[PDB]
Chain A
Amino acid sequence: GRVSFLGAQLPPEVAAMARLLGDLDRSTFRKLLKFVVSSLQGEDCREAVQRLGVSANLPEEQLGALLAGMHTLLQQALRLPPTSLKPDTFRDQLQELCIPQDLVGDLASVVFGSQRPLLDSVAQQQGAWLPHVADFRWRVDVAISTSALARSLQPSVLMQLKLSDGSAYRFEVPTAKFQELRYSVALVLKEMADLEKRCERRLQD
């Protein structure tokens, strides 16, 4: 079924935008749209917003209202997959927001053009929260002899780890604990495979 892309009600920011843009110069709107899309891509723009504002004779509060409402609207539209937010539902819901059709078409050019898969590839980057492995390395040795023991021949594995936050660690582990680690990893991999194959089917039912 259809879903309201804004959620259960319009936030006051997007209402304030919609009441402001009703006669804005499309060139300035296109510039603001480029800025918003660039800032969603990770860039920064305070000097370009400023020189546009002074060029457009736009007050700081009007630029702020415009930018905030367009960012909220496009962020909410990206949150849904584009198959669910089918373009008829998008255009109709923006028409209920009373956006002028030229600006509806301009927003659709953001939500459905080649910028879409790039933004999707950026949105996935929020999902970590806990750092992933950066790299892993090892050395495996035989002691042969030791201060306590004329001979030993026990193996040991030295291991070293770095994490995507810049943390790094080095530790050595005996063979029994290495076998426990290897078993635990294989177990969790099996459980993850089974869980994925269950969910992927049961959510079709």
Chain B
Amino acid sequence: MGRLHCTEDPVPEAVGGDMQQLNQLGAQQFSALTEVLFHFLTEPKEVERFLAQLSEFATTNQISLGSLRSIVKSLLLVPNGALKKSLTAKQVQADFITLGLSEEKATYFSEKWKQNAPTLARWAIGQTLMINQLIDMEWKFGVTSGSSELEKVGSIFLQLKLVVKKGNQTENVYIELTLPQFYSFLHEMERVRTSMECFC
């Protein structure tokens, strides 16, 4: 095989045979397979759905599940490397042609990439590391009227609940602030905001 953008490592000849099988499959079959692949790419965690739709493809086309999973992986290779490298559709199409996909079908898959890559990229960024990401926040203002020490009181306060992500776990943090501490908190958060707006 020629040089590829989606992989720096060599590729098995079985991928080339599968690409000729993409040329052997009919246009409707190749389209349905492409839709199954983009379904897996966009929602791979729905493994039961993926298995259902690939079993449907198997029984529709009389293709054995081993060959189906082979041609799937052989064709997912390029989308996978394109997502890794953030490749352009031109490079993806050139890699398909290099692997052996006929130019029309590589153009079709290139267009189906063009129409999906941004949401796929957003999903993949959503997979990167975030530390203690804020899920949600709640707040309650109030005026204290009394206590065990004072019959009448003038203190004013703010309570917050912060909801926090800790891997698969979650946590709730409860805190209380005085009014001047609320003012200083909001002032510091505005200093953050202008510092964030400097670069966003």
A residues adjacent to B (C-beta < 8 A): 136-147, 155
Contact B147 A142 (CB under 8 A): no
The interface residues of chain B lying within 8 Å CB-to-CB of A147 are 138-140
Q: When the two chains form their complex, are residues A141 and B144 in contact, meaning their CB atoms are under 8 A apart?
A: yes
Contact check: which of A136, A137, A145 meets B141 at CB < 8 Å? A145
- Which chain B residues lie closer than 8 Å to A155 at the CB level? 145
B148 to A141, Cβ gap below 8 A?
no
Beyond contacts A140-B144, A144-B142: 8 other A-B pairs, Cβ-Cβ < 8 A, are: A137-B148, A139-B148, A140-B145, A140-B147, A141-B157, A142-B145, A146-B140, A147-B139
Contact B148 A143 (CB under 8 A): no
Is B143 in contact with chain A by the CB < 8 A criterion? yes
Cβ distance A30 to chain B, nearest Cβ, rounded Å: 52
A173–B145 CA distance with the chains assembled, in angstroms:
15
**Complex: how many Å from CA A137 to CA B147?**
8
Q: Who on chain B is nearest to A156 by CB?
A: B142
Verify A141–B138 contact, CB threshold 8 A. no
Q: How far is the CA of A94 from the CA of B138 in the complex (A)?
A: 76
Q: How far is the CA of A141 from the CA of B143 in the complex (A)?
A: 6
Contact at A144–B146, with CB atoms within 8 Å? Answer: no
On whether the beta carbons of A143 and B147 are closer than 8 Å, the reply is no
A139 close to B143 (CB less than 8 A): no
20 of the cross-chain contacts (CB-CB < 8 Å) are: A137-B147, A139-B144, A139-B146, A140-B144, A140-B145, A140-B147, A141-B142, A141-B143, A141-B144, A141-B145, A142-B142, A142-B143, A143-B140, A143-B141, A145-B140, A145-B141, A145-B142, A147-B139, A147-B140, A155-B145
- Contact residues, B134-158 vs A (CB, 8 A): 138-148, 157
CB distance from A136 to the nearest CB of B (A): 8
